[PDB]
């Protein structure tokens, strides 16, 4: 599309500038253009892709939650009828959010996942697929909700299976995947015990493998382990 005339390397350079400027919509557009060049992404480029879209969808999700809370209050007994505007505007934000999720899922399907053969890259993309189905599930209320939830579950499960076979328990991608799949269990799949079990097992297995790491890898792994602990403390 609009980025078709720009060099791949220039798109990557501009994505990094957009990050520094906190222009995440631009960052995502640049990284979409880079993906659409058709070549595989490096580790750093995968990270830029994830940063860009997570920040974009993060603003939409936070806005959706604000609007959904207002809408729910409007439907309480005793609340004055204010017309269709709250629902309409929540729907507008929701549709935009769904569009961003569909865009990311489309990049993963055409054709990032199918060309990703190394465990790290494949797990990274499958985690992303689970995440964006999870964001679709956060807003889903209709007849496809169960299939959306199962699509998130299936992508996370494939990522977990690969990560357990091919990556050490301290690997940051493996750890972040487990963090997110545990959140999926807790708040999407109505399975808090599974969420807690996964977070605890992931934390304990990472703890046992820290002795193998350099100081820098130790810092990387313990940072994510603390996120698992934060959730365990909140949930127990």
């Amino acid at each position: 599309g609009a980025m078709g005339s720009m060099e791949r390397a220039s798109l990557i350079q501009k994505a990094k500038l957009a990050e520094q400027a906190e222009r995440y919509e631009d960052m995502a557009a640049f990284m979409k253009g880079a993906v659409e060049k058709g070549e595989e992404l490096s580790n750093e480029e995968r990270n830029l892709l994830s940063v860009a879209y997570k920040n974009v969808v993060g603003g939409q999700r936070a806005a959706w939650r604000v609007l959904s809370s207002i809408e729910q209050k409007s439907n309480e007994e005793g609340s004055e009828e204010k017309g269709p505007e709250v629902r309409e505007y929540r729907e507008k934000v929701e549709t935009e959010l769904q569009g961003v999720c569909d865009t990311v899922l489309g990049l993963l399907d055409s054709h990032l996942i199918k060309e990703a053969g190394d465990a790290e890259s494949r797990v990274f993309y499958l985690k992303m697929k689970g995440d964006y189905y999870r964001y679709l599930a956060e807003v889903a209320t209709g007849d496809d909700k169960k299939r959306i939830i199962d699509s998130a579950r299936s992508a996370y499960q494939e990522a977990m299976d690969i990560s357990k076979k091919e990556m050490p328990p301290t690997n940051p991608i493996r750890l972040g995947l487990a963090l997110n799949f545990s959140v999926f269990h807790y708040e999407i799949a109505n399975s808090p015990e599974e969420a807690i079990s996964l977070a605890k097992t992931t934390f304990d297995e990472a703890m046992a493998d820290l002795h193998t790491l350099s100081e820098d890898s130790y810092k990387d792994s313990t940072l994510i382990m603390q996120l698992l602990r934060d959730n365990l403390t909140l949930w127990t």
Partner: peptide, 8 residues
């Protein structure tokens, strides 16, 4: 205290 998910 919002639960944590993985932010790249």
């Amino acid at each position: 205290r919002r639960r944590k998910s993985c932010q790249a």
